[PDB]
Amino acid sequence: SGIIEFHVIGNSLTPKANRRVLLWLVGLQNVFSHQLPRMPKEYIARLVFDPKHKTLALIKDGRVIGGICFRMFPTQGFTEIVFCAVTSNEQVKGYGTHLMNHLKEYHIKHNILYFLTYADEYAIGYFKKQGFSKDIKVPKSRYLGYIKDYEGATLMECELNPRIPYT
Numbered sequence: 001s002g003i004i005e006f007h008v009i010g011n012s013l014t015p016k017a018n019r020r021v022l023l024w025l026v027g028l029q030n031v032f033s034h035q036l037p038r039m040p041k042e043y044i045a046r047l048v049f050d051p052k053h054k055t056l057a058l059i060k061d062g063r064v065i066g067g068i069c070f071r072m073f074p075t076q077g078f079t080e081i082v083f084c085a086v087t088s089n090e091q092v093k094g095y096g097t098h099l100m101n102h103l104k105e106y107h108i109k110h111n112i113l114y115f116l117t118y119a120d121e122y123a124i125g126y127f128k129k130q131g132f133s134k135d136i137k138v139p140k141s142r143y144l145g146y147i148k149d150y151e152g153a154t155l156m157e158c159e160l161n162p163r164i165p166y167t
């Protein structure tokens, strides 16, 4: 096609059955590893290939140029943002925002209207631009022991509005 494409992919059972998806998952694992260099690569690989986790992939000419790895908790009423990266050469063009907006549209469709994520300090502003806040409204009992945590990171929340804003 020669245009960007959004694919929501993952490992449903085993990743070997669809080699195109497998190659994209490896690409995602490598993008996440390169852009989240303090994350252990084995941790990234495990979660990207975990069947409870999906990744919204941004593909350009067969190559993964970014993605958001997430876990949906429909009963909890929230989705956990696990990894969020754009490949370095493709950064600062609007893709990181483009990815998050898409992810929001997907979730509105699935009637999940809250994102929770941990953020390292130097990424907080990206999440703030995407409407995330450090003020958590999801009760602690809804996410404690559901979401993964990290030493020193800041928990942030985005409240989605399904209502289309028109001025």
Ligand SMILES: CCCC(=O)SCCNC(=O)CCNC(=O)[C@H](O)C(C)(C)COP(=O)(O)OP(=O)(O)OC[C@H]1O[C@@H](n2cnc3c(N)ncnc32)[C@H](O)[C@@H]1OP(=O)(O)O
Residues within 6 Å of the ligand: 035, 036, 081, 082, 083, 084, 085, 086, 087, 090, 091, 092, 093, 094, 095, 096, 097, 098, 117, 118, 119, 120, 122, 123, 124, 125, 126, 127, 129
């Ligand atoms: C483990 C917990 C979950 C996580 O992944 S936390 C770590 C999140 N990801 C990373 O740190 C990976 C490394 N960085 C990246 O991959 C990219 O910088 C990132 C965050 C995906 C953004 O991708 P881009 O394609 O550059 O996004 P974009 O072109 O839509 O521009 C982003 C808009 O937000 C703004 N922003 C504010 N504080 C920022 C900050 N600290 N880092 C990045 N952007 C920031 C930025 O100025 C831009 O807005 P505007 O275009 O100026 O209006």
